Design a protein around this ligand. Structure first.
Ligand SMILES: *C[C@H](NC(=O)OCc1ccccc1)C(=O)O
Length: 212
């Protein structure tokens, strides 16, 4: 069911924060553990701020904290070009339950179209189920990202789900879950943008995990 997939997502969601060494942590959004010490996280969380690699990355797992130098996480792309969401290996994180097999297969994408979905996310750790209207797939999705100084950048990704719904700051990094039980309520991807009553999630397929 949607709810049982949501439970698996919830257990693997951690809070992602960034701070200077010896500084205060800025909690930015969610990251989703997928397998071993690998997580999915929107790279827009960190990559557009100055000297990201000199920062400390923080992972809050239910009130237990795991920090690491940004230079010591291994970032892997989902595909060629910029997709925002990346795979990130964090050596200090406890091993995650492998949920990769709950992600949609590339070939099954059409089966999630025109059907409801649920964004399974948190706002700073408080779990939320956010209803999304019948889904469409945008071959190229463009959305705004607001940086720390209030200025904005326009990001474009390949293959992003679009659904009617209401998002709030911090929900990025949550997982979109299909209402379609015939594909076992597959995880469709990762929430990257919200606004104007539209929710955008980068498609993440099972096949993408082959990239390590
Ligand atoms: C949610 C996970 N499920 C999973 O990996 O299913 C794989 C499967 C299930 C049934 C038949 C073939 C393959 C889990 O934690 O098990």
């Amino acid at each position: 069911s949607t709810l049982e997939i949501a439970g698996l997502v919830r257990k693997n969601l951690v809070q992602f924060g960034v701070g200077e060494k010896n500084g205060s942590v800025r909690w930015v959004m969610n990251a989703l553990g997928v397998k071993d010490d690998w997580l999915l996280v929107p790279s827009h969380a960190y990559k557009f701020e100055k000297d990201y690699e000199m920062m400390e990355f923080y992972f809050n797992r239910g009130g237990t904290y795991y920090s690491i130098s940004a230079g010591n996480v291994v970032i892997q792309s989902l595909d060629v070009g910029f997709q925002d969401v990346v795979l990130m290996k964090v050596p200090t994180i406890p091993k995650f339950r492998d949920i990769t097999q709950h992600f949609i297969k590339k070939g099954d994408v059409p089966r999630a179209l025109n059907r409801l979905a649920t964004l399974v996310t948190t706002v700073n750790g408080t779990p939320m189920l956010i209803s999304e209207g019948p889904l469409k797939m945008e071959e190229k999705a463009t959305y705004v990202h607001k940086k720390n100084d209030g200025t904005t950048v326009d990001l474009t990704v390949d293959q992003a789900w679009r659904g009617k719904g209401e998002g709030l700051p911090g929900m990025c990094g949550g997982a979109l879950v299909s209402s379609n039980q015939s594909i076992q309520n597959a995880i469709l991807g990762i929430h990257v943008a919200g606004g104007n009553s539209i929710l955008v999630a980068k498609l993440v397929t099972q096949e993408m995990f082959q990239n390590i």
